[PDB]
Design a protein around this ligand. Structure first.
Ligand SMILES: CCCCCCCCCCCCCCCCCC(=O)OC[C@H](COP(=O)([O-])OCC(O)COP(=O)([O-])OC[C@@H](COC(=O)CCCCCCCCCCCCCCCCC)OC(=O)CCCCCCCCCCCCCCCCC)OC(=O)CCCCCCCCCCCCCCCCC
Ligand SMILES: CCCCCCCCCCCCCCCCCC(=O)OC[C@H](COP(=O)([O-])OCC(O)COP(=O)([O-])OC[C@@H](COC(=O)CCCCCCCCCCCCCCCCC)OC(=O)CCCCCCCCCCCCCCCCC)OC(=O)CCCCCCCCCCCCCCCCC
Ligand SMILES: CCCCCCCCCCCCCCCCCC(=O)O[C@@H](COC(=O)CCCCCCCCCCCCCCC)COP(=O)(O)OCC[N+](C)(C)C
Ligand SMILES: CCCCCCCCCCCCCCCCCC(=O)O[C@@H](COC(=O)CCCCCCCCCCCCCCC)COP(=O)(O)OCC[N+](C)(C)C
Ligand SMILES: CCCCCCCCCCCCCCCCCC(=O)O[C@@H](COC(=O)CCCCCCCCCCCCCCC)COP(=O)(O)OCC[N+](C)(C)C
Ligand SMILES: CCCCCCCCCCCCCCCCCCCC(=O)O[C@H](COC(=O)CCCCCCCCCCCCCC)COP(=O)(O)OCCN
Ligand SMILES: CCCCCCCCCCCCCCCCCCCC(=O)O[C@H](COC(=O)CCCCCCCCCCCCCC)COP(=O)(O)OCCN
Ligand SMILES: CCCCCCCCCCCCCCCCCCCC(=O)O[C@H](COC(=O)CCCCCCCCCCCCCC)COP(=O)(O)OCCN
Ligand SMILES: CCCCCCCCCCCCCCCCCCCC(=O)O[C@H](COC(=O)CCCCCCCCCCCCCC)COP(=O)(O)OCCN
Lengths: 438, 127, 83, 97, 536, 155
């Protein structure tokens, strides 16, 4: 734990002292060192400590950090996926912004103080405004959307944290507190409602992903959406369980509506990135509902599905980025003959799309099975609703694949050595998780 | 020759596109097709949905006539000239348990009423 | 049903289990189905020619049971007054 | 059009390729090209067959260790020659063999 | 020994589809058939050990495949009599199809990838059949679904093939969704996914409906048969595998493995699918389409027989195994005819000098379909028709389907051979190698062995029926065959047109269901997220 | 049942003593307790030490239950595979025990919103028995099936 936190603080620090020409090499080595430190944290985490594997405090309640099941999986996912983002990004400015965003996100996951959690997650607010609104390839609209949505949700969460700190006297997760207040529950909930895109607060995500760089999109879908599940498991369910049980019919309505409307909206998309973004929104609904059931099957299923998404969505966003670099287009209508012209890109694309559809040899299948079982534990109709509407994902994915698969094309647009190197870890991880090493 | 056959290339778009042009599938070969055949444009055989419905209206009664008699008009006693297969008591009691079994229609049995109520079981789990 | 009483069951539970006879086939003809089954499996491809005595005997017993079932049906129908 | 310099490195059209059919020879696919027939195929196939037999041996070992027969076969089964966990056959009547 | 077959097929898939650059076209023409021959030897051993000698075996590969809280499933294979019989049939047909593909696919650029997909397809079918738990069956069900998507759409530059693959994928998604719901119901109230503990004497109707809805997808029954006819876009070897064994049979296999079906529904749905499929096949003018509609009709017969009696499951599986051989033969022969004539239309076929083996194999497969006495198809079909007499409704419809089946089958045989030559005066030829002759030898061997060995234990057991009622299927078949040879008109042009349009199920889906789907998508996106909730 | 503040503070002091006794000797199995800390608190959250210890005990118990269920399933599968066609009569007991284990594991910590897992349809069968008894005694006509002897392989 201490090694992981130290490496996390060293990665932004290293950039200040690098030669400005060695920046990319140093950043890659630091990312790998952070991954190795995360593996060490996993090694030093004994299952015998059932509640929290490790807790460290550095002199205050704010500096209380600790790892649990959700935290451990998300932290390992962030450390696994960061090297890919690093190699995909060029320039000191871009590296600095990305490394600061990563440090803030990775510190947020392990934080056990609500106020510290807020301080670390929302520090990366201007950096995303600047990243999504970059000079030539960025959109100011998307930056404004994401920034305003984040500020409003996090401010509500902050108000709830202030009330809990005033009333109980502490806001640390390790101190058992329960609250029946509905205003405070709503304040904590609104952050989760926005961060994990749920209809009608999902509009910020697609704009940000489309106008973000591939490293940014990969980080966003891979781990930024997951930060909601850490807040739910660590900062919402322990204190506001009563309000989740009181509002379960409403929670279920909003989650199922998000899943349905997002699936239908994905059908009208002509941009590959927008298709992947709306697929993520649809997938987040099952995770949110499963965790809200407050059952063992649901919490485990939600975390597992989150890992599966955090392994499948970065792959699709990476392949889309590679294709866009080769062709300078994201319109499905312009891209044809990709099967014949890019047999190697096509194979990986088909594999990842099969993963997104929750086929058996993919992590998504196991995760979905567990989440559906949790819903069936609640009610049979709850499970049936989700299972039936899954066909809509098939229709859009099939239509996209069919449009891309065949036609006439005069351009050989296949992946280079660098592109295969970038996806190989993701492919291997997907396969390993698919075979049951979740 | 299966491979290398000539094909006609679809002309490049030269006019403003309709908003719902995503309903058309064009790979670059000349004969493009709707996303679902028959949704619009030429219909196979020049047969509308109304024609198909009128056909099904003519056909449905003739097809349903055999099934309606036995299922509704006929009764267990009159459906067949024999009783269901007779089994020893130990075998019969176990076989009667199966809701989808064939021994539940034995009117001769003194447990007919219970077996008939078992066959018409619960629509959904009570718990 | 009472007028036409069931025949005696030659096959015991132990024999039917030992011959792996499903429950559905335990219908007063199980001994003959055991004979036929053992012969059919003993001759995998030549059973149609070789194993004909056992099939004949089973079919005869089945015929007698079918006649009993029809008799029971007629008796029940007469009791209810339909015929 | 004057073929590019790299075209010397690329392979020719195979015997099975129809003469009219034109394909780009630069494209790489893991499953192979349009008509394949590479030189050295006979050796590659022999290596493949050897890897197949070795994997079959490993699979056979694994299966034999994990094949659990809990009910006696009606008659002699081929598995007895190679696997020692087969219960002694009992016939339909019940007699042990 | 039991694992070996699956290993051989998956190896042949990985080798041809990942190492085809090294192996070559010839290397796939060796490794494919060699692996399939080895798998046939293993499947034969399995069949002898399990079916003939009653020795079921369970092989647990690993435990805790899914281990979340109470929910626990393991990757285990139980070879029961149903599994052994299906394994044998599947591997025999796949070995024949692999031998067939050596010459048929020589004119196709990716012969290595085709062989790889065929072997992976066979492997997933063996996983589905041999699974010991519902999760393993789902793994096989999805694997065959994906392999069908990758094989029907093999010709990507044809919009019809890609649409046919999308259609298959969507229909199979709806079906596997109903299956997943049923498996969740069964796990929740029985505690396990294993078929041994899955047994429930009384099941709520919901589970029965969900199981049936799941099964009707792969086994194309009414309302879910749209994809089968379209699946003709794919190459002929794919059609033989899907129709004869891999896809259509899975639904029946699921229904027979877990007897949760309801008698009232299965009988009506089956008899309806039999009649409709026969009527659709009457109108059809493509050789490959007629054999698909024939497959639909036969599936209707198998589904219908489950309702009639307790032995219906045995009768259905017996028909399934008998049907796979002759139907595979019909598809392979149709493909060879198409290849030799460069034509897909029945009008342009005619008498022409050919190979004796192919013409005989076509005649014998057609006779098995027709119901010619003392043939494997005859015994498996009479077992169904004779036992269906008790259900008056099912019997009448099934006899009418027998008539229509005979009529189209006889018409097709007359058109392909007896009729004078109908194609143009142009040079066309397809020379058959010894590999094709071996493939037809294998199919004929299966057909012959089926007569000697039989399909069900209760096949020749007496059905206590009057002689006139027992021999009626034969008279109806003969009458249909005679009417088909005369090429007489049976229906008015209005009905012939209706049957050519396949009942207009797809026209209904396009005009109403697809329009509603895209209007829901328009309201969800254009009107709302990008309309009401989008800033100027 | 009322808890006075004096009693609450007394229990708090006792809990602190229990913590001090646990702290005196190192234990690698501290978070896998074999016995719960008994209490009469209205809310377990009041005493944090009791809450965490009891939660760890509950997790330990649930893990044990899950493994027991897996063992029961293994004996049921072996029994089913050994008997053959006599499985229905001979494996009724093992199946009954396995289903009981499944219910105990699932029901103990189902959650606030989860329904009881009716493995074996015992609750449905009981409800149908009560409905039948009431209809028969009151002279009503029952629109539901009568209770079944066996509804599953075991229960
Ligand atoms: C003892 C033994 C020695 C061992 C060493 C140990 C010592 C420990 C620490 C010592 C390390 C040196 C500290 C660095 C100081 C200068 C850093 C800097 O200027 O940044 C850019 C600078 C790059 O310089 P440059 O490329 O040459 O061009 C800059 C030009 O001057 C102007 O260029 P421009 O005009 O084009 O501007 C473009 C701008 C685009 O415009 C923007 O985006 C503006 C956005 C506003 C701020 C960003 C808001 C979000 C920032 C979040 C904080 C990041 C960490 C996240 C972790 C969460 C923490 C809660 O983009 C950027 O500038 C970079 C984007 C990301 C960097 C933002 C992070 C810097 C925050 C504040 C810097 C400190 C200044 C203090 C001033 C002191 C006296 C003046 O340095 C970097 O390499 C990246 C930043 C490194 C961050 C570490 C600094 C700590 C801040 C974290 C706060 C935690 C509290 C502090 C405690 C720290 C430990 C005790
Ligand atoms: C469900 C049933 C069907 C849904 C709708 C069906 C009919 C809707 C009828 C309503 C309507 O027509 O709205 C149009 C109308 C906008 O006028 P417009 O014709 O579109 O063009 C005017 C602008 O210039 C337009 O210029 P623009 O294009 O530049 O502005 C566009 C802007 C315009 O948008 C807006 O101004 C309002 C956006 C949200 C409206 C909130 C609820 C409205 C309808 C909900 C209930 C409808 C049932 C009937 O859209 C946005 O960009 C903002 C949306 C981004 C945030 C997303 C948050 C969504 C929240 C709820 C979504 C709505 C529910 C549908 C999805 C269901 C999911 C649960 O929206 C409103 O006026 C809002 C109506 C109700 C507002 C809530 C109550 C306000 C509370 C004020 C209390 C007073 C405090 C006193 C103290 C004051 C001193 C401080
Ligand atoms: C660009 C790629 C080119 C190279 C291609 C690579 C080819 C890959 C070959 C495919 C692998 C197929 C093997 C599947 C089995 C997975 C192996 C495995 O997981 O090892 C098991 C051991 O089990 C085995 O070895 C299985 C035997 C493999 C071979 C046996 C027959 C081969 C036929 C394939 C059919 C497998 C069906 C399984 C479906 C789930 C680990 O044992 P445990 O200690 O119990 O692990 C815990 C379980 N869990 C993973 C869930 C955490
Ligand atoms: C279960 C135990 C063992 C598991 C083995 C599974 C069998 C082999 C699995 C190999 C990897 C699985 C997925 C491979 C990547 C997916 C892409 C693919 O399969 O095909 C690629 C390309 O194929 C490859 O290069 C790799 C394939 C090698 C082996 C594939 C065997 C079939 C795949 C099995 C299905 C996966 C199961 C997933 C769900 C159960 C695209 O092909 P097409 O879209 O048809 O276009 C090709 C061009 N043409 C138009 C001419 C057809
Ligand atoms: C009543 C429903 C009862 C059963 C429901 C099962 C199927 C319902 C509709 C089947 C649609 C699946 C067919 C399909 O995917 O294929 C289309 C692809 O079409 C699409 O992708 C459009 C989307 C349709 C998918 C869903 C639309 C229907 C939704 C059902 C209800 C709507 C909303 C209800 C709840 C959401 C290709 O069209 P074809 O031209 O026919 O291809 C065949 C090949 N050939 C060229 C040779 C003819
Ligand atoms: C020879 C070299 C081999 C080359 C390739 C093989 C690669 C590894 C192969 C086997 C190793 C499997 C470990 C992968 C993850 C398994 C994690 C795991 O299941 O254990 C959990 C540890 O808790 C934790 O919290 C673990 C957190 C860390 C897990 C990784 C998180 C995702 C990181 C990126 C994904 C890549 C994964 C690879 C607790 O398991 P349990 O308590 O739930 O019970 C188990 C039943 N389910
Ligand atoms: C007691 C009080 C009684 C109630 C009184 C309420 C009175 C008003 C309350 C509204 C407070 C919401 C604050 C957001 C205002 C909407 C955004 C401003 C619109 C806008 O044009 O912003 C542009 C881009 O913003 C964007 O692109 C953002 C798009 C819209 C943001 C969506 C808002 C976040 C989600 C809303 C609610 C979520 C949960 C609520 C609990 C930038 O404009 P410019 O820089 O060019 O300036 C040039 C001047 N025109
Ligand atoms: C119309 C559908 C509702 C949309 C929400 C759908 C799903 C949201 C569920 C979130 C789960 C936990 C949140 C707890 C309650 C929030 C909404 C529950 C529904 C609700 O409004 O109930 C009200 C009580 O809640 C309250 O009194 C508080 C309402 C929320 C306050 C709104 C903004 C608060 C922001 C405060 C920021 C932080 C403050 C911290 C000090 C009135 O119901 P009732 O019981 O009176 O029944 C009388 C009817 N006959
Ligand atoms: C053996 C088992 C049964 C298998 C299939 C049985 C199907 C029987 C259902 C058809 C019989 C009743 C039809 C309703 C009566 C309508 C009579 C005339 C129809 C009519 O005037 O309008 C049509 C409405 O479509 C319609 O008629 C659609 C109504 C159909 C109800 C949904 C049932 C599923 C149908 C699936 C196959 C049926 C294919 C043909 C219906 C065409 O409307 P339009 O497009 O011209 O309007 C213009 C666009 N503004």
């Amino acid at each position: 734990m201490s090694l992981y936190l130290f490496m996390l603080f060293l990665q932004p620090l290293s950039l200040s002292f690098v030669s400005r020409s060695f920046s990319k090499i140093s950043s890659l080595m630091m990312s790998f060192a952070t991954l190795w430190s995360a593996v060490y944290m996993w090694f030093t985490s004994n299952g015998a400590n059932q509640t929290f594997y490790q807790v460290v405090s550095w002199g205050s309640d704010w500096s209380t950090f600790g790892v649990c099941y959700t935290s451990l999986y998300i932290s390992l996912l962030c450390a696994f996926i960061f090297p890919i983002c690093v190699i995909l990004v060029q320039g000191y400015r871009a590296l600095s912004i990305l490394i600061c965003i990563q440090t803030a996100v990775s510190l947020s996951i392990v934080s056990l103080h609500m106020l510290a959690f807020y301080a670390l997650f929302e520090s990366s607010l201007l950096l995303f405004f600047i990243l999504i609104g970059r000079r030539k390839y960025g959109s100011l609209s998307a930056a404004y959307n994401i920034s305003i949505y984040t500020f409003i949700s996090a401010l509500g969460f902050l108000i709830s944290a202030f009330w809990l700190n005033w009333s109980f006297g502490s806001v640390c997760a390790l101190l058992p507190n329960e609250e029946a207040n509905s205003f405070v529950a709503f304040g904590i909930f609104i952050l989760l409602w926005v961060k994990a895109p749920l209809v009608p607060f999902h509009l910020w995500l697609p704009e940000a992903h489309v106008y973000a760089p591939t490293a940014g999109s990969v980080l966003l879908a891979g781990v930024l959406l997951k930060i909601s599940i850490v807040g739910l498991h660590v900062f919402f369910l322990p204190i506001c369980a009563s309000s989740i049980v009181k509002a379960f019919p409403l929670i279920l309505s909003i989650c199922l509506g998000s899943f349905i409307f997002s699936s239908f909206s994905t059908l009208k998309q002509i941009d590959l990135k927008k298709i992947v973004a709306y697929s993520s929104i649809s997938h987040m609904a099952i995770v949110f509902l499963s965790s809200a059931t407050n059952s063992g099957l649901g919490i485990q299923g939600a975390v597992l599905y989150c890992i599966a998404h955090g392994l499948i969505s970065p792959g699709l966003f990476l392949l889309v980025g590679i294709l866009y670099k080769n062709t300078n287009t994201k319109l499905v209508f312009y891209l044809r003959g990709l099967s014949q012209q890019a047999p190697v890109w096509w194979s990986v694309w088909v594999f990842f799309m099969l993963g997104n559809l929750a086929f058996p040899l993919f992590p998504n299948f196991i995760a979905e099975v567990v989440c559906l079982s949790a819903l069936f534990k609640n009610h049979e109709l709850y499970a049936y609703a989700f299972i039936f509407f899954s066909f809509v994902g098939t229709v859009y994915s099939s239509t996209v694949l069919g449009r891309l698969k065949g036609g006439v094309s005069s351009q050989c647009v296949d992946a280079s050595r660098l592109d295969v190197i970038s996806w190989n870890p993701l492919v291997l991880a997907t396969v390993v998780t698919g075979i049951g090493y979740m | 020759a299966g491979a290398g056959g000539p094909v006609k290339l679809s002309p490049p778009v030269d006019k403003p596109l309709p908003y719902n042009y995503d309903f058309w599938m064009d790979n670059g070969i000349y004969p493009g097709q709707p996303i679902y055949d028959g949704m619009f444009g030429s219909m196979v055989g020049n047969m509308s949905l109304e024609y198909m419905a009128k056909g099904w209206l003519v056909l449905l009664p003739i097809l349903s006539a055999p099934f309606v008699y036995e299922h509704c008009i006929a009764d267990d006693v009159t459906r067949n000239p024999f009783v269901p297969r007779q089994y020893p008591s130990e075998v019969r009691e176990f076989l009667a348990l199966f809701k989808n079994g064939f021994v539940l229609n034995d009117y001769s049995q003194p447990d007919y009423e219970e077996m008939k109520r078992r066959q018409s079981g619960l629509l959904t789990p009570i718990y | 049903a009472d007028r036409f009483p069931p025949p005696k069951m030659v096959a015991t539970q132990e024999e039917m289990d030992n011959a792996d006879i499903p429950y559905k086939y335990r219908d007063y003809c199980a001994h003959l189905i055991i004979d036929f089954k053992e012969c059919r499996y003993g001759h995998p491809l030549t059973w149609r020619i070789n194993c004909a005595h056992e099939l004949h005997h089973y079919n005869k017993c089945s015929y007698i049971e079918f006649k009993r079932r029809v008799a029971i049906a007629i008796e029940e129908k007469k009791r209810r007054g339909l015929m | 059009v004057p073929e590019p310099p790299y075209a010397k490195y690329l392979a020719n059209k195979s015997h099975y390729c129809p003469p009219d059919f034109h394909y780009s020879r630069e494209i790489y696919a893991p499953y192979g090209g349009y008509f394949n027939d590479p030189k050295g195929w006979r050796t590659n196939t022999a290596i493949a067959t050897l890897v197949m037999l070795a994997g079959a041996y490993a699979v056979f070992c694994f299966g034999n260790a994990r094949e659990e027969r809990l009910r006696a076969p009606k008659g002699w089964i081929p598995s007895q020659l190679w696997n020692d966990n087969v219960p002694t056959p009992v016939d339909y009547r019940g007699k042990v063999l | 020994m039991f694992l070996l077959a699956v290993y051989f097929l998956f190896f042949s898939a990985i080798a041809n589809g990942f190492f085809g650059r090294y192996l070559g076209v010839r290397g796939s023409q060796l490794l494919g058939p060699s692996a399939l021959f080895l798998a046939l030897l293993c499947s034969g051993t399995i069949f002898y050990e399990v079916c003939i000698q009653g020795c079921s075996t369970n092989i647990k590969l690993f435990e805790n495949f899914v281990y979340s809280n109470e929910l626990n499933v393991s990757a285990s294979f139980l070879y029961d009599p149903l599994a052994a019989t299906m394994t044998l049939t599947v591997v025999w047909i796949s070995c024949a199809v692999h031998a067939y593909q050596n010459l048929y696919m020589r004119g196709d650029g990716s012969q290595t990838l085709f062989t790889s997909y065929l072997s992976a397809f066979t492997g997933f079918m063996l996983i589905l059949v041999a699974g010991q738990n519902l999760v393993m069956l789902f793994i096989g069900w999805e694997g065959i679904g994906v392999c069908s998507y990758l094989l029907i759409g093999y010709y990507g530059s044809r919009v019809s093939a890609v649409k046919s693959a999308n259609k298959s994928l969507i229909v199979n998604k709806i079906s596997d969704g109903f299956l997943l719901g049923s498996m969740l119901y069964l796990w929740f109230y029985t505690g396990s996914f294993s078929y041994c503990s899955l047994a429930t004497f009384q099941i709520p109707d919901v589970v029965s409906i969900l199981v049936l809805l799941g099964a009707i997808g792969k086994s194309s029954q009414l309302f879910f048969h749209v994809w089968l006819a379209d699946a003709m876009e794919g190459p002929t070897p794919v059609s033989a595998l899907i129709h004869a064994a891999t896809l259509v049979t899975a639904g029946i296999y699921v229904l027979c493995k877990l007897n949760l079906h309801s008698q009232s529904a299965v009988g009506i749905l089956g008899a309806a699918t039999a009649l409709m499929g026969g009527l659709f096949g009457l109108a059809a003018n493509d050789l490959k389409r007629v054999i698909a509609f024939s497959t639909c009709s036969q599936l209707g017969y198998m589904m219908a027989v489950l309702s009639t009696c307790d032995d219906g499951a045995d009768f259905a599986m017996g028909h399934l195994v008998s049907h796979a051989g002759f139907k595979a033969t019909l598809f392979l022969s149709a493909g060879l005819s198409i290849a030799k004539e460069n034509n897909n239309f029945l009008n342009r076929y005619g008498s022409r000098q050919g190979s004796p083996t192919l013409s005989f194999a076509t005649t014998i497969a057609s006779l098995n379909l027709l119901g010619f006495p003392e043939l494997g198809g005859f015994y498996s079909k009479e077992s169904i028709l004779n036992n269906a007499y008790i259900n008056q409704g099912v019997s009448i419809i099934l006899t009418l389907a027998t008539f229509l089946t005979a009529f189209y089958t006889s018409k097709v045989l007359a058109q392909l051979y007896l009729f004078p030559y109908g194609n143009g005066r142009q040079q066309k030829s397809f020379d058959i190698d010894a590999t094709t002759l071996i493939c037809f030898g294998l199919l004929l061997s299966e057909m012959l062995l089926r007569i000697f060995t039989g399909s069900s234990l209760s096949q020749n057991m007496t059905t206590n029926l009057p002689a006139h009622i027992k021999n009626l299927p034969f008279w109806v078949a003969l009458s249909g065959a005679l009417s088909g040879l005369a090429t007489t008109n049976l229906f008015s042009s209005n009905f012939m047109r209706f049957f050519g349009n396949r009942g207009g199920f797809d026209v209904f889906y396009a005009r109403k269901c697809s329009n509603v789907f895209y209007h829901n998508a328009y309201v969800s996106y254009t009107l709302l997220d990008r309309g009401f909730l989008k800033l100027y | 049942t009322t808890a006075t503040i004096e009693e609450r503070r007394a229990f708090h002091k006792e809990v602190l003593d229990i913590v001090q006794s646990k702290l005196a000797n190192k234990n690698s199995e501290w978070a896998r307790p074999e016995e719960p800390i008994l209490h009469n608190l209205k809310s377990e959250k009041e005493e944090p030490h009791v809450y965490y210890h009891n939660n760890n005990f509950r997790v330990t118990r649930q893990l044990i239950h899950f493994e027991k269920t897996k063992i029961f399933e293994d004996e049921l599968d072996k029994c089913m595979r050994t008997h053959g066609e006599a499985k229905y009569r001979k494996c009724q007991e093992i199946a009954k025990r396995f289903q009981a284990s499944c219910r105990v594991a699932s029901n103990l910590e189902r959650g606030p919103n989860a329904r009881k897992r009716d493995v074996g349809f015992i609750y449905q069968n009981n409800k149908l028995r009560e409905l039948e008894k009431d209809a028969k005694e009151l002279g009503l006509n029952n629109p539901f099936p009568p209770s079944s002897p066996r509804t599953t392989i075991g229960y």
